[PDB]
Write a protein that binds this ligand. Sequence first.
Ligand SMILES: O=C1C[C@@H](c2ccc(O)cc2)Oc2cc(O)cc(O)c21
Ligand SMILES: O=C1C[C@@H](c2ccc(O)cc2)Oc2cc(O)cc(O)c21
Lengths: 205, 206
Amino acid sequence: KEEAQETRAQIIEAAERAFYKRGVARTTLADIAELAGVTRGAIYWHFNNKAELVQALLDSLHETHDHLARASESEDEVDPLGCMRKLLLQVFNELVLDARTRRINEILHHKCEFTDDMCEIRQQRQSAVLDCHKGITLALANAVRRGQLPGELDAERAAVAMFAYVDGLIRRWLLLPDSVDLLGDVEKWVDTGLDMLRLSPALRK
Amino acid sequence: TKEEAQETRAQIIEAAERAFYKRGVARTTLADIAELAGVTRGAIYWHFNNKAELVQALLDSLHETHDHLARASESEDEVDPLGCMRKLLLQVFNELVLDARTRRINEILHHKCEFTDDMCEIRQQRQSAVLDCHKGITLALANAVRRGQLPGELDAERAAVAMFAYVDGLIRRWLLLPDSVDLLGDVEKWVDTGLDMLRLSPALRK
Ligand SMILES: O=C1C[C@@H](c2ccc(O)cc2)Oc2cc(O)cc(O)c21
Ligand SMILES: O=C1C[C@@H](c2ccc(O)cc2)Oc2cc(O)cc(O)c21
């Protein structure tokens, strides 16, 4: 009884450590349960499987940004592209400063395989990125129907180009941090990608 | 017979690919690639010491098709080094869509290959690879610049990083949701977009 609003968050913290150390593919619920100090039944109570745990880690990333995200995906917001700028700067600040964000991103990008003996991992990822895509595409049209935004962006493609650049930059920094002074030059990195979204003719219809 | 060995390196590699693709790199070991290929046992050990070593043989095969256009791009005497960079990326994406082998080895590289302190050598290899790749995009871009094909005050290094990231995330995006990027239909649009960023971003200058 309110036994585990608490153990849920301790099970997720042990999942991160197991996954960060041994990787997702070879970690069993039992490694995690041992690490949390609970039983595999205590885990089954919150999660029906390892894919669900992975999900919980993935989903935990959207929290911090939620507001700037939602803000920028909204007409009434006087200034969409500017919330997208803030959002992006926060995304990079949080990767640099927060060990937790970084670790979960490291697990996501470099320690979580897609194999057909658990395709809910690849499935959940597809769904996550299409979700994120609809988001970027709104933010993109709202900027456009606001003069912030060369009236003929192909949105959908601008959105894909954007996610791609931010995604590959993050994974880049994760591979070689001392080669992307991400914190020091946050603004230049964020702007570079925004300059792509408006200054590039190729992203136009 | 030397020619039999060459035959059996090349079939160790073929089966590693199918092997990593279905079961992933983490839970697949040399033993299992021998049964897959139908091989002899020290054979894979003669050829391939490790697993990191075999993984690296796959990641290495990828560059082969691009050698020519990559070399020209970075040649300080080549008259159209950005044209090389352009057509190189065209061949990269063209081959990605068309060549099943390339697509699978990339899928392995991107989606079936964990970095664990448990090896080190998979991650280490990879850092080197990307640092190497980086080196070349810098020269290339630095050649396009001498020659007034890209903005004169461009930061070559930060531009090379921007470009690598875009091409890497774009490739990964397609492997994940291929029906969301007409990579083969639009190839020139995708190459073009990334290249626009290099020539038009003022944040990439100074
Ligand atoms: O909505 C987001 C958050 C961001 C992100 C979330 C988590 C993470 O680990 C890394 C990046 O990805 C993005 C990438 C973009 O191009 C545009 C965006 O609006 C976003
Ligand atoms: O030389 C290469 C190899 C290429 C590549 C892409 C995908 C892949 O799976 C393997 C290699 O990436 C590049 C990206 C560039 O901007 C410039 C380049 O010169 C290169």
